[PDB]
Scaffold this motif. Structure first.
Motif, mmCIF file in Angstrom:
data_model
loop_
_atom_site.group_PDB
_atom_site.id
_atom_site.type_symbol
_atom_site.label_atom_id
_atom_site.label_comp_id
_atom_site.label_asym_id
_atom_site.label_seq_id
_atom_site.Cartn_x
_atom_site.Cartn_y
_atom_site.Cartn_z
ATOM 1 N N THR A 23 0.806 -1.224 0.000
ATOM 2 C CA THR A 23 0.000 0.000 0.000
ATOM 3 C C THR A 23 0.852 1.294 0.000
ATOM 4 O O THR A 23 1.982 1.287 0.493
ATOM 5 N N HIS A 28 -3.943 3.299 -1.081
ATOM 6 C CA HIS A 28 -3.950 2.806 -2.460
ATOM 7 C C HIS A 28 -3.279 1.437 -2.552
ATOM 8 O O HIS A 28 -2.068 1.331 -2.355
ATOM 9 N N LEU A 30 -1.605 -1.542 -4.289
ATOM 10 C CA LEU A 30 -0.765 -1.661 -5.479
ATOM 11 C C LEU A 30 -0.849 -3.031 -6.153
ATOM 12 O O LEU A 30 -1.113 -3.088 -7.357
ATOM 13 N N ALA A 58 0.426 11.151 -4.648
ATOM 14 C CA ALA A 58 -0.489 10.451 -3.752
ATOM 15 C C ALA A 58 -1.925 10.896 -4.021
ATOM 16 O O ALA A 58 -2.844 10.078 -3.931
ATOM 17 N N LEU A 61 -3.314 9.238 -7.330
ATOM 18 C CA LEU A 61 -3.754 7.869 -7.060
ATOM 19 C C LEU A 61 -5.053 7.857 -6.262
ATOM 20 O O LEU A 61 -5.887 6.975 -6.475
ATOM 21 N N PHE A 62 -5.228 8.849 -5.362
ATOM 22 C CA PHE A 62 -6.435 8.999 -4.553
ATOM 23 C C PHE A 62 -7.637 9.365 -5.436
ATOM 24 O O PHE A 62 -8.707 8.781 -5.257
ATOM 25 N N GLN A 64 -8.093 8.677 -8.532
ATOM 26 C CA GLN A 64 -8.402 7.463 -9.288
ATOM 27 C C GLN A 64 -9.290 6.572 -8.416
ATOM 28 O O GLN A 64 -10.266 6.015 -8.916
ATOM 29 N N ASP A 65 -8.945 6.456 -7.108
ATOM 30 C CA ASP A 65 -9.664 5.661 -6.108
ATOM 31 C C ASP A 65 -11.056 6.228 -5.808
ATOM 32 O O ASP A 65 -11.959 5.450 -5.501
#
Ligand SMILES: *C[C@@H](CCN(C)C)C(=O)NC[C@@H](NC(=O)[C@H](Cc1nc2ccc(C(C)C)cc2s1)NC(=O)CC)C1CCCCC1
Length: 349
Positions: A23, A28, A30, A58, A61-62, A64-65
């Protein structure tokens, strides 16, 4: 807005860590092999990361989440009607629930979701506090409940303000991003502790502080929120729980190993002898019978530095070594410095 909300509740980690999976950032995931995680992150960012990212990387990626969470909620029969009816601020509070326990976990609050869908804010906020979710994370749950109750960022705003006002009391006049020597002094004074005491070192361990005589804005903010503290009185009540943790060998090893990284000078792989002894008398106090004889041995027969492996293995040594040193295998993987110590100490008994 949503990034800062989950940065406060879930936490931000710039380096690759393990949960229970590899993570990074705000939770996130991986992969499921450290090289596979480093490669997945490398493709996701578009550079050689080596498992270390920035706040911006960061946030990418957040985001995207978030999209992945919104897609998920809408495909769920029990969550889609509720999400559609909620406003932007309350949708962020619903996403926060999904990020914490997944769709099936949120679906369990049928009565509470029903009230939220029917816009009964005060009625929902009361019923949500009855559940085990409130007992588990009292600081996080209270912040998410208040968001559902008002439809404002007040709970997160008040906490950030309460912390940032407290930060101004310790920040360096010549440097905004850090807390100087005088500020670290004030922090320990306000907590009624000597800055060179074990309690302050235990605090540094829970705060994941990098180096002694240095305290950053990030380390303060992250540490204070993670422990659930908005005041010095709140952190003072946390110290006994931190202390009791060290009675468990697993937590003490993590703390003992952390001490080496915290005590060492940045740029040095090893730790200075004088500094290592000073921390050994602090962490190995009432745990190593040969502690004074060890320090005496080092000051006379090893004027050089202390490596990470030798530091870590001395704990394994202290635990195992008999009072007469009979169980010691002079050819049993222990470092030469420890071999030399047993050879030195044994004729002296
Ligand atoms: C820090 C060091 C400068 C090294 N230079 C190369 C000279 C120094 O002067 N050390 C002396 C002393 N260390 C301490 O008193 C430190 C001070 C603290 N640093 C921090 C950083 C962050 C926090 C937050 C988590 C709140 C708190 C503190 S206190 N204190 C400790 O390391 C805790 C034990 C050492 C202390 C041990 C004996 C040898 C001298």
């Amino acid at each position: 807005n949503i990034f800062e909300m989950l940065r406060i509740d879930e936490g931000l980690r710039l380096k690759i860590y393990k949960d229970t999976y590899y993570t990074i950032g705000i939770g996130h995931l991986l992969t499921k092999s450290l090289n596979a995680a480093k490669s997945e992150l490398d493709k996701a960012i578009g550079r050689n990361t080596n498992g270390v990212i920035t706040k911006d990387e960061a946030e990418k990626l957040f985001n995207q989440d978030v999209d992945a969470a919104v897609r998920g909620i809408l495909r769920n029969a029990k969550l889609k009607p509720v999400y559609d009816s909620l406003d932007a601020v309350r949708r962020a509070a619903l996403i926060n629930m999904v990020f914490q326990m997944g769709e099936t976990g949120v679906a369990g609050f049928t009565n509470s979701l029903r009230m939220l869908q029917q816009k009964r804010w005060a009625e929902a906020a009361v019923n949500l506090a009855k559940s085990r979710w409130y007992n588990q994370t009292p600081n996080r749950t209270k912040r998410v409940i208040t968001t559902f109750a008002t439809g404002t960022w007040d709970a997160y705003k008040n906490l950030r303000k309460k912390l940032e006002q407290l930060y101004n009391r310790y920040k360096d006049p010549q440097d905004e991003n850090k807390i100087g020597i005088d500020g670290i002094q004030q922090f320990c004074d306000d907590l009624a502790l000597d800055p060179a005491s074990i309690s302050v070192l235990i605090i540094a361990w829970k705060f994941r502080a990098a180096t002694q005589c240095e305290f950053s804005k990030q380390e303060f903010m992250d540490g204070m929120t993670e422990l659930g503290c908005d005041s010095i009185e709140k952190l003072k009540a946390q110290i006994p729980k931190m202390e009791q943790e060290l009675k468990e060998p697993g937590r003490f090893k993590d703390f003992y190993q952390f001490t080496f990284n915290f005590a060492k000078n940045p740029g040095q792989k090893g730790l200075d002898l004088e500094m290592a002894i000073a921390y050994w008398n602090l962490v190995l106090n009432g745990r190593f019978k040969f502690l004074d004889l060890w320090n005496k041995f080092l000051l006379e027969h090893h004027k050089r530095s202390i490596p990470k492996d030798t530091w870590n293995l001395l704990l394994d040594f202290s635990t195992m070594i008999a009072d007469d040193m009979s169980n010691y295998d002079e050819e049993g993987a222990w470092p030469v410095l420890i071999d030399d110590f047993v050879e030195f100490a044994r004729p002296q008994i």
